[model samples]
Target: ITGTSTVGVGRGVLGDQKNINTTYSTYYYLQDNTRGNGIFTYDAKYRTTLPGSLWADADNQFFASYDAPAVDAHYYAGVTYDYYKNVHNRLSYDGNNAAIRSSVHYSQGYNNAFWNGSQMVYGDGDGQTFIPLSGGIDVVAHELTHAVTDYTAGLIYQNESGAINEAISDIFGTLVEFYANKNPDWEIGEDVYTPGISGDSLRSMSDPAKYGDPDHYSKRYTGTQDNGGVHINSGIINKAAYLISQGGTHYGVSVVGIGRDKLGKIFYRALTQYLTPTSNFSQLRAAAVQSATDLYGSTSQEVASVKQAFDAVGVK
Candidate 1:
């Protein structure tokens, strides 16, 4: 089913061809001309005629033919879907019955990928420096999380709300990846970009300090840049949430231990339930701690650690 974007894009490249058998044949197409991002077509005439295997295999081929790896995209999307459904018991991206549509290999050699408010779009990285943007599961989750942010806070894309928007994406994006594998040492986009470049990720969740760019936030503090560097400064909140959830020490500080699931639920509850378009660092801190207290207990160590982590990041 189509969504929020009324303007559709491009003519069907695959045409109205039917599958071998009669079972409703569906041909999905990526719209390149920009009226909309992607489109899926279902040919009802060949629905029952085509073998189920052909239709299923064709689905994979369509994604793979473009630079998007169907398996990886599906895997990540499924994990994200399950996380929201199981954790929050929410239906889908919009809390409504919205079907999530993703288009990979969006533009030739495009370096970055983003959610265009309706669908997720991926780019086949410039071969010399990067690989397919969809290669990393966390990256996929990150883009999808933007949709979540859009649905919820609808956070103004500037200042603190913008930082929270970006930070929330990194937070759940990593959680989704970790939930998929329970990896102890999780890093975002480690698989998407080529290894030749020393420090070439969009952002670093584990150690934002490693990236020398002044814009990248760390445990200490951040300086002003674009929209207060919402994307860059987001690292602080990202690291804080990570430390609170995953039990890590900040910049040589004492260990702040907390259950991962508890921390995740707190943040999820805060973002989806309490946060608004104009929330700032202080509001986020209060909301998160409150969520933890409500979910666990007022005096729970999880709630304390959540507060401490926020303080460690200079949020207090």
Candidate 2:
């Protein structure tokens, strides 16, 4: 709906207060026009519908428990957009400044969130497992990075390609978390996973094996579950990315830390320039090495570290 643009203050699921961009036609709506085409958030009303109603508020304030998810979803979408534009120099997920959309409160007690090809969907967890998924900035960015991947590499979401897709999301998701400077860590979904449990997350980039994910290619799951263990096998690539940025020794192979910026530059180049729909793990290693070489030269430490990282993760 066409309306005057406005700003609203809100408390997210974690009880942190932040300001959000909104639109005021009659009631303030969670439609931010400040970036690109826009960043719009909606309420799923505990159902399976796509992009439910645009969230509306009587006043330009959102602090109610029911409003928590939408607040974070709207705010974090903006942050992710800024991440790509500022850090990666991409206009939006599509590199065309396409509007970003999200829906919160999706289905009662739903325990997951995803990018449903066109928009972001978040579920209010069953409480025992999670609280509100949008509460995690990494979670929001992770899902949005799926959109980025969809538009770029178009990696098939099954088998090795699927694992690479998942790892890309985790990689940029953690980078965006660090970009936002929000208690930055190499963990995924820690803010919203297992509220009752402390020091736990959905997955760990620093140590994927903590949750039975394979940190080395030798231990990769080969069975036909989870789309051929996409999530499980992603640990291999995730560990490589972690080693590239943080430096670590895995399976007697050592990688030198090249820091996060170069790590992101190399991977972003690989994703947007070299990867394809059916690219597998070995292809991903080649892409990263070539990307590092392209950006930092053949003799650069960035190139060496890229190779070392992949070797340490047993990707060679």
Say which candidate scores most in TM-score: 2
What are the runs in model 1 whose C-alpha is more than 4 Å off? 1-67, 182-184, 197-201, 213-225, 251-255
Question: Where in model 2 is the C-alpha error above 4 Å?
Answer: none
Please, what is the whole-model Cα lDDT of each candidate in the order they appear?
0.62, 0.95
Candidate 1 has an lDDT of 0.62
Top of the candidates by lDDT? 2
Q: For model 2, what is the alpha-carbon lDDT of residue 263? A: 90
Alpha-carbon RMSD, candidate 2: 0.6
Estimate, for each residue in 1-316, the C-alpha lDDT of model 2 and write its tens digit.
6999999999999999999999999999999999999999999999998889999999999999999999999999999999999999998899999999999999999999999999999999999899999999999999999999999999988999999999999999999999999999988999999999999999999999999999999999999999998888998999999999999888888899999999999999999999999999999999999999999999999999999999998888
Report the lDDT tens digits of candidate 1 across residue range 1-316: 2222222122111121111111122433222112122222121121222111211332323322332343344445656777877777766678774665565545567776677786666666687556666667677788888898889878776877888888888778887877776342446676666647655566776666656422123332345676766776677787777678666666455437675677678888998889999998789989998898898799988888887787677776
**All models, RMSD in angstroms:** 9.2, 0.6
